[PDB]
Amino acid sequence: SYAKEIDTLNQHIANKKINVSFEFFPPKNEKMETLLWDSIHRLKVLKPKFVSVTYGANSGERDRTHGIVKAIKQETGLEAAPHLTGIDATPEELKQIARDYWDSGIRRIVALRGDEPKGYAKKPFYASDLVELLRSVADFDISVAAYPEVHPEAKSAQADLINLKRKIDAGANHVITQFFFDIENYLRFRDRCASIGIDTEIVPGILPVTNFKQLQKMASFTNVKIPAWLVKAYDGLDNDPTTRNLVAASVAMDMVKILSREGVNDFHFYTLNRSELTYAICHMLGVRP
Amino acid sequence: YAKEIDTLNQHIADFNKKINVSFEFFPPKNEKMETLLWDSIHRLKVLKPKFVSVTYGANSGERDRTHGIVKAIKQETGLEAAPHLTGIDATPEELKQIARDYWDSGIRRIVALRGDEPKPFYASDLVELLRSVADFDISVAAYPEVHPEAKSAQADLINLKRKIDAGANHVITQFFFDIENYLRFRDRCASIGIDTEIVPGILPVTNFKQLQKMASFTNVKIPAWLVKAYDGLDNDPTTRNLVAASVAMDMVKILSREGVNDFHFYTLNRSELTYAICHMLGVRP
Ligand SMILES: Cc1cc2nc3c(=O)[nH]c(=O)nc-3n(C[C@H](O)[C@H](O)[C@H](O)COP(=O)(O)OP(=O)(O)OC[C@H]3O[C@@H](n4cnc5c(N)ncnc54)[C@H](O)[C@@H]3O)c2cc1C
Numbered sequence: 001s002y003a004k005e006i007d008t009l010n011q012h013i014a015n016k017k018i019n020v021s022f023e024f025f026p027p028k029n030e031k032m033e034t035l036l037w038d039s040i041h042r043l044k045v046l047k048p049k050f051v052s053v054t055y056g057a058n059s060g061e062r063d064r065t066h067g068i069v070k071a072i073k074q075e076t077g078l079e080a081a082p083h084l085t086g087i088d089a090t091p092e093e094l095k096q097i098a099r100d101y102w103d104s105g106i107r108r109i110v111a112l113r114g115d116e117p118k119g120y121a122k123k124p125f126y127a128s129d130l131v132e133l134l135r136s137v138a139d140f141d142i143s144v145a146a147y148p149e150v151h152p153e154a155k156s157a158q159a160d161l162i163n164l165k166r167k168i169d170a171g172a173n174h175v176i177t178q179f180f181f182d183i184e185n186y187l188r189f190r191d192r193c194a195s196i197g198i199d200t201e202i203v204p205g206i207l208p209v210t211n212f213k214q215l216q217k218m219a220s221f222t223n224v225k226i227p228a229w230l231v232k233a234y235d236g237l238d239n240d241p242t243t244r245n246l247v248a249a250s251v252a253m254d255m256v257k258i259l260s261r262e263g264v265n266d267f268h269f270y271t272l273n274r275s276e277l278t279y280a281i282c283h284m285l286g287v288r289p
Numbered sequence: 290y291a292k293e294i295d296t297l298n299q300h301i302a303d304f305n306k307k308i309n310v311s312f313e314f315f316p317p318k319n320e321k322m323e324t325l326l327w328d329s330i331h332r333l334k335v336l337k338p339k340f341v342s343v344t345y346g347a348n349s350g351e352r353d354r355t356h357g358i359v360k361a362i363k364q365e366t367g368l369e370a371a372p373h374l375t376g377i378d379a380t381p382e383e384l385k386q387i388a389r390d391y392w393d394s395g396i397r398r399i400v401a402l403r404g405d406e407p408k409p410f411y412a413s414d415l416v417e418l419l420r421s422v423a424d425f426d427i428s429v430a431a432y433p434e435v436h437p438e439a440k441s442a443q444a445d446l447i448n449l450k451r452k453i454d455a456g457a458n459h460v461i462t463q464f465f466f467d468i469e470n471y472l473r474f475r476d477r478c479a480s481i482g483i484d485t486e487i488v489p490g491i492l493p494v495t496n497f498k499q500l501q502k503m504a505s506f507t508n509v510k511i512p513a514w515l516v517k518a519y520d521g522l523d524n525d526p527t528t529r530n531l532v533a534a535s536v537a538m539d540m541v542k543i544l545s546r547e548g549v550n551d552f553h554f555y556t557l558n559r560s561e562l563t564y565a566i567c568h569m570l571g572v573r574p
């Protein structure tokens with residue numbers, strides 16, 4: 001029965017050093033700037049492995065990422081990783097960014113391709129190229145993106161998995177997944193990563209669902225399937241944030257309990273600059289002050 | 290394991306089976322508590338519960354107060370409201386007066402319990418008594434982890450069957466956290482021939498100090514994992530509500546999968562967790 005195997009899984013979660021990383025995005029107003037620093041001081045007591053700050057491809061808010069990453073190291077002492085994108089800049093520009101990050105104190109970069117505006121011919125620049133360039137400059141710990149449900153522009157699922165191995169070969173040593181809700185398809189993909197020869201954990205990116213209409217927006221660009229029961233679980237909650245936050249805690253803690261049973265001990269949270277759900281999920285993981 | 294919680298969630302979202310829920314409130318003892326109670330009632334009423342119910346402080350003498358909340362709920366909302374009644378502090382004739390007056394209000398369901406004096410009068414005796422006044426639907430208490438004063442599990446079970454044969458037709462459990470034990474208890478009730486649902490009393494754990502208090506009187510066991518899940522959260526209401534959501538909705542998803550379509554919520558006069566738990570079951574405005 002289900003009763004005996006949720007009581008075992010609760011007690012297993014009740015000895016392993018779990019590692020957690022938090023992703024923040026650069027804010028754009030004084031409301032969101034305050035929401036972000038609230039979250040940073042709340043979450044720091046869990047001693048995360050690192051925290052990261054996303055990067056506006058062509059948003060012009062490229063300079064905001066670098067300043068936050070410096071301020072986090074300053075005022076909290078957490079290791080902070082900028083994300084960095086390729087399509088926006090020339091190699092000289094990227095080598096200068098990388099050089100200054102390294103002389104700054106930054107040891108981990110999250111290296112991504114970025115997306116061209118919708119409808120644009122793609123530039124023959126890819127993430128493996130940014131990884132090679134970053135390793136030209138210094139010994140960066142480098143984190144790259146994996147797509148358990150295949151990246152929407154990939155030639156094939158085979159080619160996208162070969163690409164991930166290619167990014168590891170170029171020198172990336174940390175892997176973070178796109179968010180997902182099919183836990184079984186993540187596990188299967190994780191094993192394919194061990195088959196091809198990738199030796200770091202395929203670290204799951206956990207996205208707490210606090211606004212469903214926003215999730216429908218994000219998940220359309222990205223090819224991740226939204227299960228039917230999740231759509232049902234959120235119908236009628238458009239003006240009920242309190243219920244949304246509770247439905248979300250159960251969903252995310254279910255995920256994270258199940259990944260933990262299957263031997264995932266590394267979690268990357270898309271906090272969207274809020275702290276409520278990430279703190280509680282970590283808490284239920286045993287990641288506590 | 291993963292396909293286990295995925296098909297679990299897709300049976301909770303696919304079941305068109307009518308799920309009967311009911312909410313328990315307690316009589317407020319100040320102005321704050323009263324505002325809280327009435328916002329809960331107006332927030333939970335849209336979900337169309339089978340009934341709502343209002344507890345009774347045995348020796349308190351607040352029985353006029355329990356009766357007052359009940360009449361008020363029926364007038365303001367339309368809900369079927371059910372009083373809790375205890376026969377431990379009242380003479381039998383008083384109890385018959387209380388029942389006739391309840392019946393002329395339009396009350397049709399009474400939750401009938403012994404209560405505890407701080408008398409050889411048991412709950413099956415109050416059930417016989419109510420039933421001689423009128424054709425009440427009567428709900429009674431069941432104890433999956435044995436009532437602390439029973440000599441034995443089998444005797445506490447024989448007792449519960451005595452209350453059914455005495456005229457009751459609804460069963461509501463003390464709260465619990467060992468679900469496998471609840472399921473084995475419901476099997477025994479089936480065997481010994483009780484023909485109503487053994488309806489789970491769901492208690493959302495919004496405050497673990499309060500739960501520690503309620504659970505000492507009651508011989509109800511707190512799992513080691515439940516203590517762990519609340520360690521360090523004395524001053525974190527936000528994290529406690531989120532932790533409580535995951536605890537309740539696992540319990541309710543499993544119970545629902547095993548065929549239990551009837552839930553009774555110990556709302557503790559707050560509506561946040563109950564409205565969310567019902568929402569996930571498919572109970573919606
Ligand atoms: C954890 C995470 C963090 C992210 N952070 C950011 C961020 O800060 N800013 C931002 O703008 N975006 C960010 N993204 C989004 C990301 O930029 C997009 O998903 C983008 O569309 C792909 O980026 P990539 O780094 O995975 O590129 P790549 O790994 O290069 O792959 C992209 C696509 O190109 C294909 N491909 C790879 N190599 C070749 C080749 N040689 N020839 C042909 N096709 C090839 C792949 O199969 C895939 O379809 C993030 C994504 C994740 C998962």
Ligand SMILES: Cc1cc2nc3c(=O)[nH]c(=O)nc-3n(C[C@H](O)[C@H](O)[C@H](O)COP(=O)(O)OP(=O)(O)OC[C@H]3O[C@@H](n4cnc5c(N)ncnc54)[C@H](O)[C@@H]3O)c2cc1C
Pocket residue numbers: 343344345346347373374375400401402403404405411412413429430431436437438439440444445448452461462463464490
């Ligand atoms: C859903 C629910 C609602 C409640 N509401 C209230 C409330 O509003 N107010 C309140 O004060 N309390 C309330 N209680 C608490 C309840 O009154 C206590 O658990 C009380 O100790 C027993 O009540 P009961 O109706 O189950 O009694 P009983 O069914 O009579 O059981 C009491 C004990 O006596 C034993 N027993 C039964 N018959 C006999 C017999 N003939 N000879 C010897 N032993 C016997 C039983 O096995 C049991 O151990 C509630 C409990 C529940 C589960």
